[PDB]
């Protein structure tokens, strides 16, 4: 299963494969945490 | 079965060594089509159909 750093490129495409919608991952006391929204 | 076990162990070793790829392949997602595409792109070379 040996593979060089070429695999790197793949993820750059994968992240580049993905409007921007995030998801609330927790909320409390007027503070929310949102995963996603890389361009925010 | 032995070949499948060896391939799976090698894949697990690769994922453990390559943290970022593991993160990308493991982050939960409603649509698994991108996950399948990347997995088959990176693995189809050195794994069996099963």
Swiss-Prot record, chain A:
Organism superkingdom: Bacteria
Compartments where located: Cell membrane
Coiled-coil stretches: none
Free-text function comment from the UniProt entry: Produces ATP from ADP in the presence of a proton gradient across the membrane. The alpha chain is a regulatory subunit.
Family listed: Belongs to the ATPase alpha/beta chains family.
Subunit composition and interactions: F-type ATPases have 2 components, CF(1) - the catalytic core - and CF(0) - the membrane proton channel. CF(1) has five subunits: alpha(3), beta(3), gamma(1), delta(1), epsilon(1). CF(0) has three main subunits: a(1), b(2) and c(9-12). The alpha and beta chains form an alternating ring which encloses part of the gamma chain. CF(1) is attached to CF(0) by a central stalk formed by the gamma and epsilon chains, while a peripheral stalk is formed by the delta and b chains.
Protein name: ATP synthase subunit alpha
Organism: Mycolicibacterium smegmatis (strain ATCC 700084 / mc(2)155) (Mycobacterium smegmatis)
Lineage of source species: Bacteria, Bacillati, Actinomycetota, Actinomycetes, Mycobacteriales
Span of the entire protein shown here: 5 to 50 of 548
Curated annotation (Swiss-Prot), chain B:
Disulfide bonds: none
Source organism, top-level taxon: Bacteria
Location relative to the cell: Cell membrane
Assembly, per entry: F-type ATPases have 2 components, F(1) - the catalytic core - and F(0) - the membrane proton channel. F(1) has five subunits: alpha(3), beta(3), gamma(1), delta(1), epsilon(1). F(0) has three main subunits: a(1), b(2) and c(10-14). The alpha and beta chains form an alternating ring which encloses part of the gamma chain. F(1) is attached to F(0) by a central stalk formed by the gamma and epsilon chains, while a peripheral stalk is formed by the delta and b chains.
Annotated function: F(1)F(0) ATP synthase produces ATP from ADP in the presence of a proton or sodium gradient. F-type ATPases consist of two structural domains, F(1) containing the extramembraneous catalytic core and F(0) containing the membrane proton channel, linked together by a central stalk and a peripheral stalk. During catalysis, ATP synthesis in the catalytic domain of F(1) is coupled via a rotary mechanism of the central stalk subunits to proton translocation. This fusion protein includes a component of the F(0) channel (subunit b) and of the F(1) subunit (subunit delta). Two copies of subunit b and one of delta together form the peripheral 'stator' stalk which links F(1) to F(0).
Family named by the database record: In the N-terminal section; belongs to the ATPase B chain family.
Additional remark text: Binds 2-aminothiazole antibiotics, which are antitubercular agents.
Protein name: ATP synthase subunit b-delta
Natural source organism: Mycolicibacterium smegmatis (strain ATCC 700084 / mc(2)155) (Mycobacterium smegmatis)
Lineage: Bacteria, Bacillati, Actinomycetota, Actinomycetes, Mycobacteriales
Gene behind this protein: atpFH
